[PDB]
């Protein structure tokens, strides 16, 4: 009934949104960290190939390794440029818009939780509208609803209550007066009228919106209404704008999965950096046909498909560095070494050996 | 008077904080971008040094360039590691804690703003308590108070209303009944008692805290009380914990200002990477003596002090590269991927020279 406390059907979907928004900074940390890790993997491969080229300087395979090193080094450079120009803004914006909306929701939900008179009369009721609910640890009436921003640790980005379409649990409500409102719990936050709601001497002078514009509290003796937020469209200046802002920002995330961060499977001449290097440094001529690039590539990779690239990479990975550069009982094969700084110092040594 | 609408002295300092927390995401973008920029500058110097070494293969200056290239590559590596492990967590946590707290405040302020019965009676009153306030543009009562998360572009955030000590404007209140409450404006959000406040059939069963634990609304006919937040100490499980968390996270930011992102200025032997490489590659003796290291360095830098490091970097920057690979001096070129493609060409020719 109008002007009564809100049963769990009304506030549980808000808890679920709040708990999912809680994970957005965890996903931002995940993605920022993954971008760096994938740049670092690209850089490690560029360094392994560079070390192989320096150790084998002069051979046809060393020239292949230079092509490989250039490939992965260009990949690492582009990934850092993408972290700087694109992912940083995406992830800060999604963190900020989601955390702000979560604050708007939690302050409303926290008000309902506390605005009660008894164990059976209040603004926040259980599923059947029998008992007012209590917070117990992270749960409210058995519902995960921390009403807090949890400590931020990396968590894979997940989209359940906030998806590409919108807030999938916040549908058009068919019957708020029976599905949202209790039958007898008293709650002055359910209307702006003075008899049973927020008004003192008379009704509030207008409808009041709560939870960043989601619920509209009429100043008449009528049930609340809610925005349908499950099929959003871009807009400005809406009363529920923080909902749109967070939806727009989460939908915009690519994660660390754009081409900078992924390995290429294509033929060798189609791989980043390769053909420009062949034309300028090996063929030493422009306007060379595709057959000429493939023939020159065969000199260094035995072929021009992805399988021959992989074969060169395996040679790089099995190549050992000197035992004194990597611990004592430590691995020496390049493929068993990782870490940019560590491989950087090893490259420097072999580069100095080449200088002599 | 108790149980009445809130004059501007109550909510204005909350506007001040909300407006400043709006800046914290801008500062996170600024720092994440600055760190990546500084890494990129380190890498460019690594690449210029490496290209110089390739073109000048065999000379003592080329070996100095190898030492220089190792230095900057290590600095670039460490910066990306710091970005990943430390700066990202710092700036995501500050963005989130500030934005969350700002949402908690803005919902409460937006609720007071709307809960009114007339232009003279409501929950959000002006300075003198004569009229309820209205939001006009980005101000409420003449005070910046947008109650929005504004678009994010990089900017250093102000640290005026939330600083190292806490929230300067959220002081111990000497007289809430008269400084925070009007005497006649009606506002059911001002108490939990049933006659004038949130209670219907009787008072609420306990006090209610609002704005993430800042204001406590008694279930009796008494004035509100507020937390003093201007001298915070680290704590957990507090009713006002979101205030503590945003304060802790802002205080903890280093920026892109740690040793990974700054250039070194002392002698060559103490510079990142130098002595290990000299010992391993040139002296062929680990744990060598200062004198030995510095004698060996003199053969390539013509000295062992920062001024000779700078001199080699000038030589690196003046080295020309082929016009068709691109301004042709290495110091006139910037951009990691671009300098990478150039290093690749010269390395391919080094292989051909055999």
């Amino acid at each position, epitope marked *: 009934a109008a002007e009564k406390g809100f049963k769990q059907a009304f506030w549980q979907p808000l808890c679920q949104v709040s708990e999912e928004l809680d994970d957005q900074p965890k996903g931002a940390l995940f993605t920022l960290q993954a971008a760096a890790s994938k740049i670092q993997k690209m850089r490690d491969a560029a360094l392994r190939a560079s070390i192989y080229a320096e150790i084998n300087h002069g051979t046809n395979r060393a020239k292949a390794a230079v092509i490989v090193a250039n490939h992965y080094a260009m990949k690492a450079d582009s990934g850092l440029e993408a972290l700087k120009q694109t992912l940083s803004s995406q992830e800060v914006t999604a963190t900020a818009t989601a955390s702000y909306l979560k604050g708007r929701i939690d302050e409303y939900l926290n008000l309902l939780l506390q605005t009660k008179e008894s164990g059976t009369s209040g603004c926040m009721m259980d599923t059947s509208g029998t008992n007012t609910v209590t917070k117990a640890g992270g749960t409210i009436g058995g519902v995960p609803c921390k009403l807090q921003l949890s400590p931020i640790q990396p968590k894979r980005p997940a989209a359940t209550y906030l998806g590409k379409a919108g807030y999938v649990g916040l549908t058009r409500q068919a019957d708020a007066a029976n599905n949202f409102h209790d039958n007898d719990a008293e709650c002055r936050l359910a209307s702006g009228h003075n008899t049973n709601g927020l008004g003192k001497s008379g009704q509030l002078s207008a409808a009041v919106t709560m939870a960043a514009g989601y619920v509209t509290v009429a100043n008449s003796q009528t049930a609340v209404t809610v925005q349908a937020l499950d099929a959003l469209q871009e807009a400005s200046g809406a009363a529920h704008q923080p909902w749109i802002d967070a939806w727009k920002a989460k939908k915009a995330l690519t994660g660390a999965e754009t081409a*900078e961060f992924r390995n290429e499977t294509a*033929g060798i*001449a189609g791989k*980043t950096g390769v053909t420009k290097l062949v034309e300028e440094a090996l063929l030493k001529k422009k306007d060379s046909e595709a057959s000429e690039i493939q023939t020159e590539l065969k000199k260094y990779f035995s072929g021009h498909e992805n399988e021959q690239w992989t074969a060169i990479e395996k040679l790089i990975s099995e190549q050992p560095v000197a035992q004194n550069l990597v611990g004592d009982n430590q691995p020496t094969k390049l493929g068993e070494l990782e870490g940019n700084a560590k491989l950087t110092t090893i490259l420097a040594y072999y580069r100095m050996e080449t200088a002599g | 008077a108790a149980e009445k609408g809130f004059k501007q002295a109550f909510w204005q300092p909350l506007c001040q904080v909300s407006e400043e927390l709006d800046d914290q995401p801008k500062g996170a973008l600024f720092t994440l971008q600055a760190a990546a920029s500084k890494i990129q500058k380190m890498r460019d110097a690594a690449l210029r040094a490496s290209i110089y070494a390739e073109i000048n293969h065999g000379t003592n200056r080329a070996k100095a360039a190898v030492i220089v290239a190792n230095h900057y590559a290590m600095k670039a590596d460490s910066g990306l590691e710091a970005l990943k492990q430390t700066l990202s967590s710092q700036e995501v946590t500050a963005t989130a804690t500030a934005s969350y707290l700002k949402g908690r405040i803005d919902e409460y302020l937006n609720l007071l703003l709307q809960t009114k019965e007339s232009g003279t009676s409501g929950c959000m009153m002006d300075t003198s308590g004569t009229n309820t306030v209205t939001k006009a543009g980005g101000t409420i009562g003449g005070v910046p108070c947008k109650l929005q998360l504004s678009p994010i572009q990089p900017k250093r955030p102000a640290a005026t209303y939330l600083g190292k000590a806490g929230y300067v404007g959220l002081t111990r209140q000497a007289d809430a009944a008269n400084n925070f409450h009007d005497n006649d404006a009606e506002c059911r959000l001002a108490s939990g008692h049933n006659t004038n406040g949130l209670g219907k059939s009787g008072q609420l069963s306990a006090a209610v805290t609002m704005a993430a634990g800042y204001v406590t609304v008694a279930n009796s006919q008494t004035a509100v009380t507020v937390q003093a937040l201007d001298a915070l100490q680290e704590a957990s499980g507090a009713a006002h914990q979101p205030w503590i968390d945003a304060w802790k996270a802002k205080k903890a930011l280093t920026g892109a200002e740690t040793a990974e992102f700054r250039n070194e200025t002392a002698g060559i032997a103490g510079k990142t990477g130098v002595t290990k490489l000299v010992e391993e590659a040139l002296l062929k003796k680990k744990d060598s003596e200062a004198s030995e290291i510095q004698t060996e360095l003199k053969k390539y830098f013509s000295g062992h002090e920062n001024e000779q490091w700078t001199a080699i970097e000038k030589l690196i920057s003046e080295q020309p590269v082929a016009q068709n690979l691109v301004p042709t001096k290495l110091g006139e070129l910037e951009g990691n991927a671009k300098l990478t493609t150039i290093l690749a060409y010269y390395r391919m020719e080094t292989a051909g020279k055999f």
Partner: nanobody, 123 residues
Framework: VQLQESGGGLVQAGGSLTLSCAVS????????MGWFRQGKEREFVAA????????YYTDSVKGRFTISRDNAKNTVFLQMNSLKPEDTAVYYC???????????????????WGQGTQVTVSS
């Protein structure tokens, strides 16, 4: 990631069209951009390298079409002059990371593709 083409329409022969392709969700300056067109096989039209240093065309549009990029607007343009009925096709934007040679940009697979924009030129 979205590559969105614009500027299609019905033109007369010998006229001109300017295709635009706005890129979102990507670091535009990291990508070479090219144009393709397609009950016939899809064919390469033109491309520009990631840094803007080179442009490539198929012969049948050489001297008639001009590709250009505007990094500040995240947009690659295809200027189409002296149009001919055989130029009727759907024109697709496409993006290839750090693309830098005619081989890649005419004959390799790209990383991202637009949805197309229709270009019909009357006789």
């Amino acid at each position: 990631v979205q590559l969105q083409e614009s500027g299609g329409g019905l033109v007369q022969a010998g006229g001109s069209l300017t295709l635009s392709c706005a890129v979102s969700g990507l670091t535009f300056s990291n990508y070479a951009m090219g144009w393709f067109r397609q009950g016939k096989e899809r064919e390469f039209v033109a491309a520009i390298t990631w840094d803007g240093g080179n442009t490539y065309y198929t012969d049948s549009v050489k001297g008639r079409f001009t590709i250009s990029r505007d990094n500040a607007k995240n947009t690659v343009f295809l200027q189409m002059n002296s149009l001919k009925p055989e130029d009727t096709a759907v024109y697709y934007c496409a993006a290839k990371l750090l693309g830098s040679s005619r081989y890649e940009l005419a004959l390799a697979g790209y990383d991202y593709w637009g949805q197309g924009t229709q270009v019909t030129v009357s006789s």
